[PDB]
Amino acid sequence: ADWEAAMLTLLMMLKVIEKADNAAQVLTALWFMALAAHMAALATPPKLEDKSPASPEMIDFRVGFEELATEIGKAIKLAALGKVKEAQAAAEQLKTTVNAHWQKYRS
Amino acid sequence: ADWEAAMLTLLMMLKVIEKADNAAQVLTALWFMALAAHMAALATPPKLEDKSPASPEMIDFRVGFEELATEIGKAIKLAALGKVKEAQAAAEQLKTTVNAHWQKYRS
Amino acid sequence: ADWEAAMLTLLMMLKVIEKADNAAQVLTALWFMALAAHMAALATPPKLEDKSPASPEMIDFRVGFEELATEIGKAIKLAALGKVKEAQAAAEQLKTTVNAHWQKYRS
Ligand code: NI
């Protein structure tokens, strides 16, 4: 989907993870976070629509999303092993990566 | 997945959106609608299994699904910005596209 | 995502299906099962990371996952038609395929 709809989805799902109780609520929201990244991995932010697809500034955005999909995958495995608290702790660091990525291309 | 299982998923998720209360319930169901389209974008309806992959009748089905995935993406962004009512209003028009697509290839 | 995080997701979602009440809870968990398979269809289990990508042992793992994604698709259509009980019955046989696949590459 659109880039900022996925980024707004990621931010809202982090608010569902922090207020979650069991590991099922955390695991499902983390998979919705993975879902939004897969639908928007092909997307392009609004301020980068007039940049070369091989431009390093656009190429910087591509690997930055790989890091985001990678960190989300890590938190899913922690939430899969039943570690509901340590996965929420991984969601704290995940929000740092999400917020830093969203601000760099929000415009 | 199978074409009509996704189309039945889309129809049921629309029934979850109309009876939803907050923006989280609408956003999650809209992502399930996006999920079903991604799993079945490669699929083929039963009545079109004996049509050429480059046939305009089959090619008409392909772009018709792009329109569906496009409208779903629009409603996700409206539900991402917090506009829970205007996104439900986008789900009303979404059901028109879903119903018209499903009837054309239901058989 | 990682192979065993998806396999742990599949196992937990089966526990959500057996204790589910309506067809919406079964259909959503079955789509999360389809979600985990799509994110990890490209993945590789830990004990098979040093095997040729064209090796029959690794190639056996690939088709084994196709069977899993195929059976999940079948149960989704049964849960899409409203058959909440017959889809739960398909989840019983689904757990057999999941457990047999996970044990063969758990290590
Ligand atoms: Ni995909």
Side-chain angles (χ1 to χ4, degrees), chain C residues 53-99:
Chain C
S55 175
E57 184 173 358
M58 253 295 302
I59 249 176
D60 203 304
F61 164 78
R62 242 56 173 173
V63 282
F65 228 71
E66 287 191 40
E67 298 180 357
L68 183 47
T70 307
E71 270 202 21
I72 290 180
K74 301 171 178 177
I76 290 180
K77 181 168 179 172
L78 284 173
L81 297 165
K83 311 175 183 180
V84 60
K85 289 202 174 191
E86 195 172 3
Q88 279 184 336
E92 317 280 8
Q93 222 297 300
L94 242 182
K95 196 189 187 309
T96 295
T97 304
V98 175
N99 283 130

Side-chain angles (χ1 to χ4, degrees), chain A residues 23-24 27-29 31-32 34-36 38 73 76-77 79-82, chain C residues 1-2 4-6 8-9 12-13 16 32 35-40 46:
Chain A
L27 190 69
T28 49
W31 273 110
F32 268 118
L35 219 196
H38 187 10
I76 290 180
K77 181 168 179 172
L81 297 165
Chain C
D2 143 87
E4 64 166 286
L8 286 170
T9 297
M12 183 185 299
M13 293 304 170
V16 185
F32 268 118
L35 219 196
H38 187 10
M39 257 53 154

Side-chain angles (χ1 to χ4, degrees), chain B residues 25-52:
Chain B
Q25 295 162 323
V26 180
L27 190 69
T28 49
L30 284 171
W31 273 110
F32 268 118
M33 293 188 64
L35 219 196
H38 187 10
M39 257 53 154
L42 36 122
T44 296
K47 68 179 302 179
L48 288 188
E49 76 163 7
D50 290 288
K51 292 293 177 298
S52 174

Side-chain angles (χ1 to χ4, degrees), chain B:
Chain B
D2 143 87
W3 178 84
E4 64 166 286
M7 295 303 303
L8 286 170
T9 297
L10 301 172
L11 288 174
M12 183 185 299
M13 293 304 170
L14 296 164
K15 282 156 55 181
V16 185
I17 295 171
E18 61 171 17
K19 295 192 173 187
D21 307 315
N22 56 50
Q25 295 162 323
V26 180
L27 190 69
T28 49
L30 284 171
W31 273 110
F32 268 118
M33 293 188 64
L35 219 196
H38 187 10
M39 257 53 154
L42 36 122
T44 296
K47 68 179 302 179
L48 288 188
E49 76 163 7
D50 290 288
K51 292 293 177 298
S52 174
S55 175
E57 184 173 358
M58 253 295 302
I59 249 176
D60 203 304
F61 164 78
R62 242 56 173 173
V63 282
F65 228 71
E66 287 191 40
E67 298 180 357
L68 183 47
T70 307
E71 270 202 21
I72 290 180
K74 301 171 178 177
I76 290 180
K77 181 168 179 172
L78 284 173
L81 297 165
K83 311 175 183 180
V84 60
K85 289 202 174 191
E86 195 172 3
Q88 279 184 336
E92 317 280 8
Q93 222 297 300
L94 242 182
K95 196 189 187 309
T96 295
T97 304
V98 175
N99 283 130
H101 175 87
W102 185 54
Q103 235 176 318
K104 201 172 186 177
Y105 316 96
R106 168 165 52 183
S107 176

Side-chain angles (χ1 to χ4, degrees), chain A residues 1 11 26 32 47-48 58 60-61 69 73 80 86 93 95 102:
Chain A
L11 288 174
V26 180
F32 268 118
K47 68 179 302 179
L48 288 188
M58 253 295 302
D60 203 304
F61 164 78
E86 195 172 3
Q93 222 297 300
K95 196 189 187 309
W102 185 54

